[PDB]
Design a protein around this ligand. Structure first.
Ligand SMILES: CC(C)(COP(=O)(O)OP(=O)(O)OC[C@H]1O[C@@H](n2cnc3c(N)ncnc32)[C@H](O)[C@@H]1OP(=O)(O)O)[C@@H](O)C(=O)NCCC(=O)NCCS
Length: 589
C-alpha cells in the first residue's frame, strides 16, 4: 500500500493529554493520585518508555499496530448480545408495497444491485476515496469495502472470531418466516437476472409458508449474548446437518430478510426499531442471523434498510455502499439474463433437539429484554443546519458535538467521558480513534449557560462557546491525524499485558477505567439520501447519539435504556433542541 502507517504519538504527549482530558472529570484527590501514577509510568527509563519502544517495534513489523488490539477491545471481546448493543442499523426511506410482488421486485432489484456492486469490488474498480471536511484531498484506505460481503462473526466463549472469506456457486441467504433459504445468484460468473431473482423469491415465499416443513427459528440464537450463542452453537455443531446449514450461512454474500408486516405505525422511529432488533420474536426478531455482516431487510409493509455487524467495517464505508445500491435501483433495468433450467432454492435443514429447544426459549427471553429496554427516538432538528453553522465560522461537527455536551449537562448536571468516532482511514487499515468531546472548555461553556446564579453575560457565553468549538476542532484534527490518545493507550496496555498479566497501576487506576465508560457515545454518519444510521448506548446508564448534518437540518438518532432512571431519550432530544436554539441565539448577538 502507498498509504502512510498509523503514527505512534510521542509518549509524553499522550500522557499529558490524558491527564488534561480527565482532570475535570474526577475528584481533586483522585486526580492527584493519577498525576503521581502517570508521572511514575512515563518517567525516564520507566515502564512507559519500555512499552513505547515495543510499540515502535510493533509499528515497524505490522501494517497497523492497533488493528488487532482495537478489533478485540472494541468488538470481539464484548460479551453483550449484538442487537442494539453493537450492530448498527441503516434505515432506507419508507417504501410502498401494495402486493407481495412489489416487495419481491424491490428485493430482486436490491440483490442485483448487490451483485454488480460486488463485481466492481472483485475487479477493484471502486474509485479510491479521498478525505473531505477536515484536512481533505488525501487518499483513504479502502480495505473496509472488502469486508462488506466476505465476513462472518463467529461466537466464542470469551473472545469472538472475525472470519475473513469464495464459494462457487456464490449465494445469498434469504430469510422468510424465520426460515433460511439458499439462493444461488452466480453460477459460472453468470449473474441471475433481476427477472429470475423475482421468480426465485416467489418460490421462497411459497415454501416459507409450508407448515409441515416449518423448522425452528434458529436465527433467534444469534441474537443472544456472545458466550450464550457460542454455547448453543456448540450444541448445534454436534449434528452434521446443522454443520452444513451453518457453513452455508457462513459463506453467503449477505442476508435478505423478507420481514412480515410490522404491527405499529411506520414512523422513522418504529421503522428503526424493526431494523435494530426486529421487534422481538413475536415480530421479525428471529428472521435474522446477526453474525453475518450485512442483513438487508425488505419487509412486506415497506420497511426496508440494512442491519450491520460492526466488527468488519464502519458506517461511512457502509453508507457509501448502500447509497450506491439504492442509486443503482434508480438506474434502469438492463437487458436480461435468463436461466433455464432454473433450480428451486434450497431450504436449510436443522436437526433440533431438546437442548436446542431450551436455548431457543432463553434467547427468546433475552431478546425480549433488549426490545423492551431500548428507549429510542429519531429527532429531526429543522431550525437550521450546516449552512448557518458555517456562517458562524464554525465546524458543523464541532458545533454539534458542543451542543450535545450542553444538552447532556443541562439535563444531568455534569459532563461525562464522551466518545466520538474519528476516522483514521488516512492510514493503512485505518478504522477509527476517539475524539474526547468532554473537554475542559466544554465544561466552562455549559456551566456558564446553565448556572443562573453566575449570571454570566451573554457576550461572555458567546466567547466560551467559540472557545469550546475551537477546542473541539483542535481535538478533532488531533484524532484524525493519529495524534489522539485512546488507540495509543490501548496498545501500551496490551503490550504490558503481554509482559505480565498484572497491568501497571497506570491502567488499573480508577481514572483510566472511568475514562473509558462512555456515558455519551456518538458519531456523525452523513448521507445524501433519505436514509439514517442508528445504534444503542455502550453502557447501562448512557446514550447513543448518531447525527446526520445537512445544509438546513440535523437528524438525531438518540438511544438509551429504560432501565436507567437517570436517562431518557425523549428528554435528551429536547435538550439537544434547546441547546441548538441557545447556541443560535448566542451567535446572533
Ligand atoms: C471527525 C469528523 C467527524 C469531522 O467531520 P467533518 O466532515 O470534517 O465535519 P465538519 O463539521 O468539520 O464539516 C466539514 C464541512 O464544514 C466546513 N467547515 C469546517 N470548519 C469550518 C469553519 N471553521 N468555518 C466554515 N466552514 C467550516 C468544511 O469546509 C466542510 O465543508 P464542505 O461541506 O464544503 O466540505 C470526520 O473527520 C470523521 O472522522 N468522520 C467519520 C465519522 C465516522 O467514522 N462515522 C462512522 C463511525 S462507525
Amino acid at each position: 500500500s502507498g498509504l502512510p502507517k498509523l503514527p505512534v504519538p510521542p509518549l509524553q504527549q499522550t500522557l499529558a493529554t490524558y491527564l488534561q482530558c480527565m482532570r475535570h472529570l474526577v475528584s481533586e484527590e483522585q486526580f492527584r493520585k493519577s498525576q503521581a501514577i502517570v508521572q511514575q509510568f512515563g518517567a525516564p527509563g520507566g515502564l512507559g518508555e519500555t512499552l513505547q519502544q515495543k510499540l515502535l517495534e510493533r509499528q515497524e513489523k505490522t501494517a497497523n499496530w492497533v488493528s488487532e488490539y482495537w478489533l478485540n477491545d472494541m468488538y470481539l471481546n464484548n460479551r453483550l448480545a449484538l442487537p442494539v448493543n453493537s450492530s448498527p442499523a441503516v434505515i432506507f426511506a419508507r417504501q410502498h408495497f401494495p402486493g407481495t410482488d412489489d416487495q419481491l421486485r424491490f428485493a430482486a432489484s436490491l440483490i442485483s444491485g448487490v451483485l454488480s456492486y460486488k463485481a466492481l469490488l472483485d475487479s477493484h474498480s471502486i474509485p479510491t476515496d479521498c478525505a473531505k471536511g477536515q484536512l481533505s484531498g488525501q487518499p483513504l484506505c479502502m480495505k473496509q469495502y472488502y469486508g462488506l460481503f466476505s465476513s462472518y462473526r463467529l461466537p466464542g466463549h470469551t473472545q469472538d472470531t472475525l472470519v475473513a472469506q469464495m464459494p462457487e456457486p456464490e449465494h445469498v441467504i434469504v430469510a422468510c418466516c424465520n426460515q433460511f433459504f439458499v439462493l444461488d445468484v452466480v453460477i459460472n460468473f453468470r449473474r441471475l437476472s433481476e427477472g429470475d431473482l423475482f421468480t426465485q423469491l416467489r418460490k421462497i415465499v411459497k415454501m416459507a409458508s409450508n407448515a409441515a416443513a416449518r423448522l425452528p427459528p434458529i436465527g433467534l440464537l444469534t441474537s443472544d449474548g456472545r458466550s450464550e450463542w457460542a454455547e448453543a452453537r456448540t450444541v448445534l455443531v454436534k449434528d452434521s446437518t446443522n454443520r452444513d446449514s451453518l457453513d452455508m450461512i457462513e459463506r453467503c454474500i449477505c442476508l435478505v430478510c423478507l420481514d412480515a408486516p410490522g404491527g405499529v405505525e411506520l414512523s422513522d422511529t418504529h421503522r428503526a426499531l424493526q431494523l435494530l432488533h426486529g421487534g422481538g420474536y413475536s415480530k421479525n426478531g428471529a428472521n435474522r442471523w446477526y453474525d453475518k455482516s450485512l442483513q438487508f431487510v425488505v419487509g412486506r409493509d415497506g420497511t426496508c434498510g440494512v442491519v450491520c455487524e460492526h466488527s468488519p467495517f464502519d458506517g461511512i464505508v457502509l453508507v457509501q455502499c448502500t447509497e450506491h445500491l439504492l442509486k443503482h435501483m434508480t438506474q434502469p433495468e438492463l437487458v436480461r439474463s435468463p436461466m433455464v433450467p432454473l433450480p428451486a432454492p434450497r431450504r436449510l435443514r436443522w436437526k433440533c433437539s431438546p437442548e436446542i429447544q431450551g436455548h431457543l426459549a432463553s434467547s427468546a427471553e433475552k431478546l425480549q429484554r433488549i426490545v423492551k429496554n431500548l428507549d429510542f427516538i429519531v429527532y429531526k432538528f429543522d431550525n437550521y443546519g450546516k449552512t448557518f453553522i458555517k456562517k458562524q465560522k464554525c465546524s458543523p461537527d464541532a458545533f454539534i458535538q458542543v451542543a450535545l455536551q450542553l444538552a447532556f449537562y443541562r439535563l444531568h448536571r455534569r459532563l461525562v467521558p464522551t466518545y466520538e468516532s474519528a476516522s483514521i482511514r488516512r492510514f493503512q487499515e485505518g478504522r477509527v480513534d476517539n475524539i474526547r468531546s468532554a473537554t475542559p472548555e466544554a465544561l466552562a461553556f455549559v456551566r456558564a449557560v446553565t448556572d443562573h446564579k453566575a449570571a454570566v453575560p451573554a457576550s461572555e457565553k458567546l466567547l466560551l462557546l467559540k472557545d469550546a468549538i475551537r477546542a473541539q476542532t483542535a481535538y478533532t484534527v488531533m484524532a484524525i491525524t493519529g495524534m489522539a490518545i485512546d488507540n495509543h493507550l490501548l496498545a501500551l496496555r496490551e503490550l504490558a499485558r503481554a509482559m505480565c498479566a498484572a497491568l501497571p497501576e497506570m491502567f488499573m487506576d480508577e481514572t483510566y477505567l472511568m475514562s473509558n465508560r462512555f456515558v455519551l457515545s456518538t458519531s456523525q454518519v452523513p448521507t445524501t439520501t433519505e436514509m439514517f444510521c442508528c445504534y444503542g448506548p455502550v453502557v447501562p446508564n448512557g446514550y447513543g447519539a448518531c447525527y446526520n448534518p445537512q445544509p438546513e437540518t440535523i437528524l438525531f438518532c438518540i438511544s438509551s435504556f429504560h432501565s436507567c432512571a437517570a436517562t431518557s431519550s425523549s428528554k435528551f432530544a429536547k435538550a439537544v433542541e434547546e441547546s441548538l436554539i441557545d447556541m443560535r441565539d448566542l451567535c446572533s448577538l
